[PDB]
Enzyme design. Structure first.
Site, PDB file in Angstrom:
ATOM      1  N   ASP A 195       0.998  -1.075  -0.100  1.00 55.57           N
ATOM      2  CA  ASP A 195      -0.109  -0.066  -0.042  1.00 55.57           C
ATOM      3  C   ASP A 195       0.895   1.394  -0.012  1.00 55.57           C
ATOM      4  O   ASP A 195       0.678   2.173   0.590  1.00 55.57           O
ATOM      5  CB  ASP A 195      -0.951  -0.008   1.176  1.00 55.57           C
ATOM      6  CG  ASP A 195      -2.098   0.931   0.948  1.00 55.57           C
ATOM      7  OD1 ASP A 195      -2.319   1.448  -0.364  1.00 55.57           O
ATOM      8  OD2 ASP A 195      -2.892   1.104   1.904  1.00 55.57           O
ATOM      9  N   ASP A 219      -6.469  -9.714   4.826  1.00 49.28           N
ATOM     10  CA  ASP A 219      -7.773 -10.293   4.306  1.00 49.28           C
ATOM     11  C   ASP A 219      -8.887  -9.813   4.990  1.00 49.28           C
ATOM     12  O   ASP A 219      -9.987  -9.861   4.239  1.00 49.28           O
ATOM     13  CB  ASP A 219      -7.515 -11.890   4.386  1.00 49.28           C
ATOM     14  CG  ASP A 219      -6.536 -12.440   3.526  1.00 49.28           C
ATOM     15  OD1 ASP A 219      -5.512 -11.945   3.523  1.00 49.28           O
ATOM     16  OD2 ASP A 219      -6.938 -13.374   2.670  1.00 49.28           O
TER      17      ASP A 219
HETATM   18  C1  LIG Z   1      -3.873  -1.746  -0.614  1.00 50.10           C
HETATM   19  N1  LIG Z   1      -3.226  -3.075  -0.555  1.00 50.10           N
HETATM   20  S1  LIG Z   1      -3.906  -4.396  -0.218  1.00 50.10           S
HETATM   21  O1  LIG Z   1      -5.462  -4.442  -0.990  1.00 50.10           O
HETATM   22  O2  LIG Z   1      -3.083  -5.396  -0.029  1.00 50.10           O
HETATM   23  N2  LIG Z   1      -4.545  -4.164   1.535  1.00 50.10           N
HETATM   24  C2  LIG Z   1      -3.634  -4.124   2.478  1.00 50.10           C
HETATM   25  N3  LIG Z   1      -2.363  -3.639   2.169  1.00 50.10           N
HETATM   26  C3  LIG Z   1      -1.470  -3.225   3.433  1.00 50.10           C
HETATM   27  C4  LIG Z   1      -1.834  -3.721   4.595  1.00 50.10           C
HETATM   28  C5  LIG Z   1      -3.114  -3.955   4.883  1.00 50.10           C
HETATM   29  C6  LIG Z   1      -3.566  -4.138   6.185  1.00 50.10           C
HETATM   30  C7  LIG Z   1      -2.988  -3.401   7.487  1.00 50.10           C
HETATM   31  C8  LIG Z   1      -2.899  -2.270   7.748  1.00 50.10           C
HETATM   32  C9  LIG Z   1      -3.825  -1.209   6.847  1.00 50.10           C
HETATM   33  C10 LIG Z   1      -2.149  -1.568   8.857  1.00 50.10           C
HETATM   34  C11 LIG Z   1      -2.316  -0.104   9.254  1.00 50.10           C
HETATM   35  C12 LIG Z   1      -1.207   0.387  10.371  1.00 50.10           C
HETATM   36  C13 LIG Z   1      -0.705  -0.582  10.853  1.00 50.10           C
HETATM   37  O3  LIG Z   1       0.171   0.094  12.125  1.00 50.10           O
HETATM   38  C14 LIG Z   1       1.342   0.367  11.571  1.00 50.10           C
HETATM   39  N4  LIG Z   1       1.969   0.398  10.319  1.00 50.10           N
HETATM   40  C15 LIG Z   1       3.283   0.620   9.885  1.00 50.10           C
HETATM   41  C16 LIG Z   1       4.137   1.052  11.047  1.00 50.10           C
HETATM   42  C17 LIG Z   1       3.626   1.115  12.452  1.00 50.10           C
HETATM   43  C18 LIG Z   1       2.428   0.703  12.778  1.00 50.10           C
HETATM   44  F1  LIG Z   1       2.206   0.841  14.071  1.00 50.10           F
HETATM   45  C19 LIG Z   1      -0.295  -1.867  10.392  1.00 50.10           C
HETATM   46  C20 LIG Z   1      -1.126  -2.276   9.500  1.00 50.10           C
HETATM   47  O4  LIG Z   1      -1.129  -3.565   9.183  1.00 50.10           O
HETATM   48  C21 LIG Z   1      -1.711  -4.212   8.005  1.00 50.10           C
HETATM   49  O5  LIG Z   1      -1.321  -5.524   7.972  1.00 50.10           O
HETATM   50  C22 LIG Z   1      -4.081  -4.079   3.780  1.00 50.10           C
HETATM   51  F2  LIG Z   1      -5.340  -4.500   4.113  1.00 50.10           F
HETATM   52  N1  LIG Z   2       1.618   8.447  12.648  1.00 49.02           N
HETATM   53  C1  LIG Z   2       0.917   9.331  12.106  1.00 49.02           C
HETATM   54  N2  LIG Z   2       1.113  10.495  12.114  1.00 49.02           N
HETATM   55  C2  LIG Z   2       0.568  11.711  11.590  1.00 49.02           C
HETATM   56  N3  LIG Z   2      -0.323  11.549  10.776  1.00 49.02           N
HETATM   57  C3  LIG Z   2      -0.555  10.141  10.655  1.00 49.02           C
HETATM   58  C4  LIG Z   2      -0.282   9.188  11.362  1.00 49.02           C
HETATM   59  N4  LIG Z   2      -0.906   7.782  10.717  1.00 49.02           N
HETATM   60  C5  LIG Z   2      -1.546   8.598   9.802  1.00 49.02           C
HETATM   61  N5  LIG Z   2      -1.710  10.009   9.435  1.00 49.02           N
HETATM   62  C6  LIG Z   2      -2.532  10.602   8.859  1.00 49.02           C
HETATM   63  O1  LIG Z   2      -3.912   9.898   8.986  1.00 49.02           O
HETATM   64  C7  LIG Z   2      -4.479  10.588   7.689  1.00 49.02           C
HETATM   65  C8  LIG Z   2      -5.550   9.127   7.375  1.00 49.02           C
HETATM   66  O2  LIG Z   2      -4.679   8.014   7.051  1.00 49.02           O
HETATM   67  P1  LIG Z   2      -5.451   6.673   6.770  1.00 49.02           P
HETATM   68  O3  LIG Z   2      -6.659   6.505   7.734  1.00 49.02           O
HETATM   69  O4  LIG Z   2      -4.280   5.510   6.897  1.00 49.02           O
HETATM   70  O5  LIG Z   2      -6.062   6.785   5.369  1.00 49.02           O
HETATM   71  P2  LIG Z   2      -5.126   6.954   4.153  1.00 49.02           P
HETATM   72  O6  LIG Z   2      -3.965   6.627   4.039  1.00 49.02           O
HETATM   73  O7  LIG Z   2      -5.071   8.710   3.875  1.00 49.02           O
HETATM   74  N6  LIG Z   2      -5.897   6.604   2.859  1.00 49.02           N
HETATM   75  P3  LIG Z   2      -6.409   5.248   2.924  1.00 49.02           P
HETATM   76  O8  LIG Z   2      -5.237   4.091   2.912  1.00 49.02           O
HETATM   77  O9  LIG Z   2      -7.022   4.721   1.527  1.00 49.02           O
HETATM   78  O10 LIG Z   2      -7.374   4.710   3.827  1.00 49.02           O
HETATM   79  C9  LIG Z   2      -3.595  10.459   6.789  1.00 49.02           C
HETATM   80  O11 LIG Z   2      -3.642  11.890   6.074  1.00 49.02           O
HETATM   81  C10 LIG Z   2      -2.289  10.462   7.396  1.00 49.02           C
HETATM   82  O12 LIG Z   2      -1.176  11.402   7.079  1.00 49.02           O
HETATM   83 CL   LIG Z   3      -4.708   1.674  -2.806  1.00 43.38          CL
END
Ligand SMILES: CNS(=O)(=O)Nc1nccc(Cc2c(C)c3ccc(Oc4ncccc4F)cc3oc2=O)c1F
Ligand SMILES: Nc1ncnc2c1ncn2[C@@H]1O[C@H](COP(=O)(O)OP(=O)(O)NP(=O)(O)O)[C@@H](O)[C@H]1O
Ligand SMILES: [Cl-]
Ligand SMILES: CNS(=O)(=O)Nc1nccc(Cc2c(C)c3ccc(Oc4ncccc4F)cc3oc2=O)c1F
Ligand SMILES: Nc1ncnc2c1ncn2[C@@H]1O[C@H](COP(=O)(O)OP(=O)(O)NP(=O)(O)O)[C@@H](O)[C@H]1O
Ligand SMILES: Nc1ncnc2c1ncn2[C@@H]1O[C@H](COP(=O)(O)OP(=O)(O)NP(=O)(O)O)[C@@H](O)[C@H]1O
Ligand SMILES: Nc1ncnc2c1ncn2[C@@H]1O[C@H](COP(=O)(O)OP(=O)(O)NP(=O)(O)O)[C@@H](O)[C@H]1O
Ligand SMILES: [Cl-]
Ligand SMILES: [Mg+2]
Ligand SMILES: [Mg+2]
Ligand SMILES: [Mg+2]
Ligand SMILES: [Mg+2]
Lengths: 259, 300, 249, 300
Positions: B153, B180
């Site tokens: 992503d 998933d």
């Molecule tokens: C569009 N591509 S896709 O269709 O493959 N969908 C998906 N892609 C990618 C991931 C996932 C699920 C998921 C999400 C969205 C997720 C969000 C936040 C997270 O926290 C942190 N993240 C990074 C650093 C530190 C954190 F604390 C962990 C997460 O972990 C995950 O696994 C999807 F559903």
């Molecule tokens: N750790 C963080 N610090 C500051 N801003 C954050 C942080 N994590 C997420 N954001 C902000 O939160 C907003 C929403 O993020 P998110 O809910 O992940 O959806 P998105 O990445 O903007 N689009 P999508 O992935 O389709 O849902 C974004 O504008 C990010 O910049």
């Molecule tokens: Cl996407």
């Protein structure tokens, strides 16, 4: 509950009365007035439906903003859970018998001019052989930058519907149709063969293109090796050109001439 | 090799670890809400004060109607984030569940996402995008080398920056169950997915390269470079890839993005080739005040 | 409309168990295992030309049968109303509605045993059949006109109706009289002593004189002659009657 | 013939002057004494008028019909006021009450010959001759003076009394009442002529057949045919008629009943031929104490 007698006869007396029976009630929250008008025109037609493969439509209690749809309670399991239970034994005969019950109820709905719009294995109830279709005509209602599409629902949607899908558009503007209902039956027929969804769980975007472009169902019909006659029914219902998909009355014959 | 630890980075990572060492188990009562940082695709993110410590955190809420058995599998799989320690990855404090939603408490990046920066800055200059491209590459190698997981992503909204000048990745596929559970649900107005993913073909980190390239072209021109969503996806699959305007950006940058936006993943450049690319060799030797530019552009 | 426990949740709101108060008709009867086997089959019937069979409760000494309350007028009163405008089309359309409903019951293996104009309800075109599976000598003139010769030949004071030869072929015979009421707006036999009707029907000479003396169309009369056939094996099925009605002028 | 005896004329004149004292009949004016029997949708009670001291026989017919045709029945029954004969039961009045039509008539303490036969076992020939005269005389009175036939001759409709009188009742004096109830009831014995069973045209000749078959039953003490009612009717229509056993009854009686039971009504004897028949010439000249026999047989 016994009421006033209405005429006398040789076989006892016949009274008016009221009956209390177990039913299923779906509540919906409404967010213009022309919505309720269309809903009224539909529920009148739905109230007249009579078919042993179609759930009995009792009526609707419009109490704004709460809308209630009353149908008879369905004993048994969904066809969705029935086919995914490893303790269930399916075969070329059982699947054809189940399919034809669905075809008969769908053919009846289309004969009454009712497009289902959400035929799926979750809206079919199986009960020791008895097959009943539920939740027909429920996508044209109007009630409570991103679309939320389930993986289950996408497997039943025809290419023309997912091609018009776009964030912000109301679902009641999607091209639901008899042909789209046939396409959904194609997926029901797949579940009866493979006990699983036709598309791998993946990103909704990837699902939309694979369905909208017709390439997904082609890979399924190619990679998955079912009976040649079984596969033909599948490719007919899943036809990219909606005009090439058969009717349900034609599907009945196609199913009947299976091994 | 390219994951070698800089001294200032090693001390910042060490500091973050000793800061994280004193938080403990996170509960909903621990958090006082400051502001809402944004939302999208089944998730909303708040800036939050964790009251036991003093830490300002970012709290992401994922509403999910799922069984508690797989809900705990998500919380369990997210614990892997405790081992994702890199200057190019967003820090992880903890994850829990309350009132139908899953919380993911992470490092707050006060500069937000490049999607937000782009909205205020109009465009991101080439020299700055060179620093971004390094971090995305390094971050992607870190996840591939050290954790065997791809991002899945990559897009401007998931590349976070802060006033310290750091460029970190977030929202990557660390939990198979969480993937998933929410992947097949939401679809946006824009798409950064590779053609092979759209076609359902086997996809690797090469798909993340496509997303990086498409992101750089958007951040360079300040416009999504590619209407029913199917037409958009079908364009990505059957129509030629986007590219930068001619007279503006350097040739090395144009070649860098065009090698990222090759429709065939086998001919598309991989991460070791991009690491030694002319655009990267130049951008990495350059001295850029990203912290200053970020602050002066968005107002920190 | 009393609410109940929620069953599950989906995209379209929530669904709950419940109960509903609906308008129904009730028939009380004083007096067995055959009833239990039959009512289970009767409750599964679904056809828009057959009345809905809600069920049956057996609190002694009364046996209650519960069906949908039918709006409209009986086909008996309908054809006997001077304003009612009948014609070769309307009579055929009405008849075919009954045939579709009777054909369904026979397909489900259900002999009606009491098909008549008073057990058919007409409502602005909609036709619905009622009172199926319900079966000193008190014999109404209206009822005799629907009874096939084999039934009236076995009528004996003291014998229960359970011994009378009810059958699908008898049901077709009863339809023949319904068809006649659609043509003549009256009974086929003049009002006379029940004894005379018993012999005229049992000997077959009654409907023979009806078909002869009456001036009904050759096609319309052919329907009657087929349904009223003295040999029950020569009467058509309702599925066959459908095509016979369809090919009328 | 058909003219009045002196004792008869005074008894008829006495009944008429007694009938001139009843007036309008209401349900409240009657106290029930006993129940005399039932049959064909009608129960008959011995009752007592209260305005007069007269003991009457009250027939009650249950009819679910519109009040318009109910008043037509009551109006058509008024013709009975003109049916004054020693061989016809007298009529007091008729009214409607609580869904039932009441017919108040002369009480015959001897009952019906059907009831007498049950207690007598059989009725001897010399007495059936006295019965045959009255039936013929009562039938010809209805034909001559009222142009109506009986339509229901049988032992239950031939009433006798301790005075020795023999009268007919329950004949078709009201067309509307005929049409209302005739199609309803069917018993186990049938006295209907073959031409009526076949639905062909019929006349008083049909009453001749009913008389003849009645004489055969009352002579042998058993209904002479025989089971399903249709088999009984079909036997009347297609099988030969019954006849009396040879050795017991006289030849003149055998010829009398045989001339009554001819299936062809045109070849059947009519009233005038039966009136001058050898069995009638003989039985009318005879002196037989019917009043005495009836009382000693039934117990009066
Ligand atoms: C569009 N591509 S896709 O269709 O493959 N969908 C998906 N892609 C990618 C991931 C996932 C699920 C998921 C999400 C969205 C997720 C969000 C936040 C997270 O926290 C942190 N993240 C990074 C650093 C530190 C954190 F604390 C962990 C997460 O972990 C995950 O696994 C999807 F559903
Ligand atoms: N750790 C963080 N610090 C500051 N801003 C954050 C942080 N994590 C997420 N954001 C902000 O939160 C907003 C929403 O993020 P998110 O809910 O992940 O959806 P998105 O990445 O903007 N689009 P999508 O992935 O389709 O849902 C974004 O504008 C990010 O910049
Ligand atoms: Cl996407
Ligand atoms: C079996 N043959 S059938 O089918 O023709 N049936 C019928 N037969 C005959 C008559 C009728 C109708 C009728 C009946 C029943 C009737 C009964 C009693 C009555 O009182 C007195 N009667 C005679 C003398 C004095 C009276 F006070 C008048 C009646 O007047 C009637 O007209 C029939 F329906
Ligand atoms: N389900 C029903 N809905 C409405 N009216 C009904 C229903 N069932 C019976 N009736 C009416 O109730 C009255 C009595 O019914 P019923 O006992 O069947 O008499 P009938 O069939 O009309 N004549 P009979 O043959 O003597 O019983 C009649 O007026 C019927 O038309
Ligand atoms: N008539 C019915 N009788 C019994 N159970 C029912 C009936 N209709 C629906 N249900 C069940 O009630 C639950 C909720 O219904 P529903 O909202 O229709 O969910 P669903 O169709 O299974 N999934 P979705 O398509 O997203 O709504 C499901 O478990 C259904 O199987
Ligand atoms: N005026 C009367 N006086 C005495 N008994 C009478 C009189 N009228 C009728 N009965 C008796 O009342 C009973 C019932 O008569 P009725 O109602 O006419 O039926 P039925 O003629 O006996 N049998 P059915 O063939 O069915 O009419 C019989 O026993 C008659 O003898
Ligand atoms: Cl049919
Ligand atoms: Mg459903
Ligand atoms: Mg994000
Ligand atoms: Mg009825
Ligand atoms: Mg009588």
């Amino acid at each position: 509950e016994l009421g006033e007698p209405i005429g006398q006869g040789r076989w006892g007396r016949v009274h008016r009365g009221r009956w209390h029976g177990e039913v299923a009630i779906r509540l919906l929250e409404m967010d213009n007035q022309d919505h309720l008008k269309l809903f009224k025109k539909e529920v009148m037609n739905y109230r007249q439906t009579r078919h042993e493969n179609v759930v009995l439509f009792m009526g609707a209690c419009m109490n704004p903003p709460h809308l209630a749809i009353i149908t008879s309670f369905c004993k048994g399991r969904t066809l969705h859970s029935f086919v995914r239970d490893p303790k269930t034994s399916l075969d070329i005969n059982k699947t054809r018998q189940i399919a034809q019950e669905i075809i008969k109820g769908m053919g009846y709905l289309h004969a009454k001019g009712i497009v289902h719009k959400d035929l799926k294995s979750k809206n079919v109830f199986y009960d020791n052989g008895k097959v009943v279709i539920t939740d027909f005509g429920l996508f044209g209602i109007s009630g409570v930058n991103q679309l939320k599409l389930s993986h289950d629902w996408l497997c039943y949607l025809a290419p023309e519907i997912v091609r018009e899908m776009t964030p912000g558009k109301d679902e009641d503007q999607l091209p639901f149709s008899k042909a789209a209902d046939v396409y959904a039956f194609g997926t029901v027929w797949y579940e009866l063969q493979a006990r699983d969804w036709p598309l791998k769980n993946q990103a909704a975007e990837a699902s939309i293109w694979q369905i909208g472009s017709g390439e997904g169902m082609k890979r399924v019909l190619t990679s998955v090796s079912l009976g040649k006659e079984v596969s033909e029914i599948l490719s007919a219902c899943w036809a990219f050109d909606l005009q090439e998909r058969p009717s349900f009355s034609l599907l009945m014959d196609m199913l009947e001439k299976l091994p | 090799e390219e994951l070698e630890l800089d001294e200032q980075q090693r001390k910042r990572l060490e500091a973050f670890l000793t800061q994280k060492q004193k938080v403990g188990e996170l509960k909903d009562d621990d958090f006082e809400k400051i502001s809402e940082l944004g939302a999208g695709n089944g998730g909303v993110v708040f800036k939050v004060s964790h009251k036991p410590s003093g830490l300002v955190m970012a709290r992401k809420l994922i509403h999910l109607e799922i069984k508690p058995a797989i809900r705990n599998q998500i919380i369990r799989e997210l614990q892997v984030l405790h081992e994702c320690n890199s200057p190019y990855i967003v820090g992880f404090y903890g994850a829990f569940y309350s009132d139908g939603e899953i919380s993911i408490c992470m490092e707050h990046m006060d500069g937000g996402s490049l999607d937000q920066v782009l909205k205020k800055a109009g465009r991101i200059p080439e020299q700055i995008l060179g620093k971004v491209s390094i971090a995305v590459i390094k971050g992607l190698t870190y996840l591939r080398e050290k954790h065997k997981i791809m991002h899945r992503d990559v897009k401007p909204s998931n590349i976070l920056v802060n006033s310290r000048g750091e460029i970190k990745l977030c929202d990557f596929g660390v939990s198979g169950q969480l993937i998933d559970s929410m992947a097949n649900s939401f679809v946006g107005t824009r798409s950064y997915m590779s053609p092979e993913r759209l076609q359902g073909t086997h996809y690797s980190v090469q798909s993340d390269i496509w997303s990086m390239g498409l992101s750089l072209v958007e951040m360079a021109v300040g416009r999504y470079p590619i209407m029913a969503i199917f037409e958009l996806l079908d364009y990505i699959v059957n129509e030629p890839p986007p590219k930068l305007p001619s007279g503006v950006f350097s040739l090395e940058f144009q070649d860098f993005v065009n090698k990222c936006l090759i429709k065939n993943p086998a001919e598309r450049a991989d991460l070791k080739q991009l690491m030694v690319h002319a655009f990267i060799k130049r951008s990495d030797a350059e001295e850029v005040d990203f912290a200053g530019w970020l602050c002066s552009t968005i107002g920190l």
